[PDB]
Chains A and B, each alone.
With several copies, the nearest count.
Chain A
């Protein structure tokens, strides 16, 4: 029986494992680097061990350091999570060698299924269906044509070394094959210097269907239905559902049996996943790839009732790692209502989904637990005030909602996302709302390219009514105001608030009276807001009761930073960015001329030119050193531009002698 489990991966997975260990009374040991003073998993663990320097690369990946950490803290088991170092066979072998128990598959199985070549051979030898493609050494055009005829059009031609979708040609008719093959060979030669090609069957409407299997140490194995990961963009999962809609009971039984057979053939221990490419038109699934680890989408499966009790996959994984028999064998497992998971990242969908950093300055979570009709569960690795650093775990959180039907689950997810208020970091909440409200998504199962299919519709801008602008300006002004009274004799106090709307510098002019009644002016529009009362919430926010115009009374919550204002109105949640401050405010760089003919301060000797002739120099940048009275005086550039010296070095200059010309290069 385990007493201590060390988690080698940070993030929300560490918190999940810590929670399930606290449920089972296992002491938790965490792993961190020197740059993590307030990491959530470190605070949620009984003990933590620092792995060394914090470059975020050497740490969390040094297997020897993790082994030493586990040995020093008397850890009984090592759980790698689903992050980095969770699929390295060498790390698992080292864990087993030191005497620690690895929570996962044997190293041989993990190594064999990570090459993408031997795994295919094993899957073929096991009788599991494989994608009907040709990959033989024979590149003869007649043999390739015969293989294409055998496979059945449509087909796809790829380069052997092709990657990123390059060198792939879609063939629909036999006539086009003779041209498409030549074009693909030419492109492969021009990109990879290898004319060899691979012919496979092209699926026009693919769906990534994942079946989850769990195997004991004694050889027993049980499947856990299916998971749909069709909604994704550039191999980045976004929204998942369980069970997969539009799948018959017989089809699910067939997929589960195939998954169990494949896991038995590979000799798997622990929790694993198998992803197939299912076709809606052909109703046939083909093995695509197996993951020998836990997955981020496992909660949507946990929302499966083992002997009536809810499933805890990590608990079962720990029990198997301890070496205990499975409780039941595919008999006490029952399907339940559909559950849906949304992955809230930290990227901007409008600007090409590029990851962006920031700090979670306000993190009001949706109401989690058993609601009136649905069950809501939020899993995150960040708390309010934490700063998410770009290019390191871009996912902010995962939110799962379980109902009785897919429509109810979708409505619950919409409501929960509407209540998830994040201020400080750009997110994809609006993108998730657009995806959920898309008619194609609500119809049923959709293809993988759905994100690429409705890009114009999903990336629609969110409209900001003038009421939101007025309320944001009023909230900002109230934040500025302390206990001082607004009074100008015989006048209304004038104020201005500048926001950025789509790059447009919108300005709201407000006139405020002594009775705390604001009037905000827009183009041919006036909005009157009477602030009845304000209350400073402990979470650095303010609850404001307002009367808009003279007839719309309601209360809302506002959060004001130095860069944006966020309002939680009954209409929804809005964040308006203040007009950014200039970085050159009051900049006086000793000159602004385009020539900058500077003169020597005193007679002396020019010792060294700190910049080469013809070099670009910024304002205030040293260009040469002048020595007088055994003291080094350094001449600085007064403006940006190419600097050309006039006086030779190691010489002598006089009072007010020209030194160099700074010409602003175009």
Chain B
């Protein structure tokens, strides 16, 4: 049934409703595509909207951090603009 019987299901749902994620998503098909903060998406997907950012001031266009989905620890890498050498 399970290699380890540990459950670890003491998680908290996201603090923001996912139903408004589309509010932050601009029109991808456009002459000039607007930019948005991907963290607003992350806040509506992870447990308790908690997110430990890895290098908050270095990449600045690639958001890397730790989060949890129903108690499962996951590393999140998200695009937040043009990739640079520092972001890569």
Contacts and interface: CB of A to CB of B under 8 A. Distances in A.
Is A–B contact present in the complex under a CB 8 A cutoff? yes
Contacts of B82: 629, 631
A633 interface: yes
Main secondary structure of the interface of B (DSSP, over half): loop
A482 to B, nearest CB: 15
A630 interface: yes
Interface in B28-83: 31-35, 56-57, 81-82
Contacts of B56: 588
Interface string A611-635: 0000000000000000101111110
Contacts of B81: 633
Contact of A634 (B32, B33, B35): B35
B31 A632 contact: no
B35 A627 contact: no
A562 to B, nearest CB: 14
Contacts, number: 18
Interface in B1-36: 31-35
Contacts of A629: 82
Contacts of B31: 630
Contacts of A634: 35
B25 to A, nearest CB: 14
Main secondary structure of the interface of A (DSSP, over half): strand
Contacts of B33: 630-632
Nearest to A627: B32
B41 to A, nearest CB: 17
Nearest to A632: B34
Contacts of A632: 32-35
Nearest to B35: A632
Interface string A57-68: 000000000000
Contacts of B34: 632
A540 to B, nearest CB: 16
A637 to B, nearest CB: 15
Residue of B34, B56, B57 ringed by the most chain A CB atoms within 10 A: B34
Interface in A578-627: 588, 627
B35 to A, nearest CB: 5
A630 B32 contact: yes
Contacts of A627: 32
B9 to A, nearest CB: 20
Nearest to A607: B32
Residue of B56, B81, B82 ringed by the most chain A CB atoms within 10 A: B82
Residue of A588, A629, A632, A633 ringed by the most chain B CB atoms within 10 A: A632
A636 to B, nearest CB: 10
Contacts of A631: 32-33, 35, 82
Interface in A626-654: 627, 629-634
A47 to B, nearest CB: 30
Residue of B35, B57, B81 ringed by the most chain A CB atoms within 10 A: B35
B74 to A, nearest CB: 23
Contacts of A588: 56-57
B82 to A, nearest CB: 7
Nearest to A634: B35
Contacts of B57: 588
B18 to A, nearest CB: 20
Nearest to B32: A630
B1 to A, nearest CB: 28
Nearest to A590: B57
Interface string A380-411: 00000000000000000000000000000000
Nearest to A625: B34
A586 to B, nearest CB: 11
Contacts of A633: 35, 81
Nearest to B33: A631
Residue of B32, B33, B35, B57 ringed by the most chain A CB atoms within 10 A: B32
Contacts of B32: 627, 630-632
Nearest to A631: B33
Interface string A498-522: 0000000000000000000000000
Contacts of A630: 31-33
Interface in A174-228: none
A35 B57 CA distance: 41
B33 to A, nearest CB: 6
B40 to A, nearest CB: 13
Nearest to B26: A632
A655 to B, nearest CB: 15
Nearest to A630: B32
Contacts of B35: 631-634
Given A588-B56, A630-B32, A631-B33, 12 more contacts: A588-B57, A627-B32, A629-B82, A630-B31, A630-B33, A631-B32, A631-B35, A631-B82, A632-B33, A632-B34, A633-B35, A634-B35
18 contacts: A588-B56, A588-B57, A627-B32, A629-B82, A630-B31, A630-B32, A630-B33, A631-B32, A631-B33, A631-B35, A631-B82, A632-B32, A632-B33, A632-B34, A632-B35, A633-B35, A633-B81, A634-B35
What are the 10 closest A-B residue pairs judged by CB atoms, nearest first? A632-B34, A630-B32, A632-B35, A632-B32, A627-B32, A631-B33, A633-B35, A634-B35, A630-B31, A631-B35
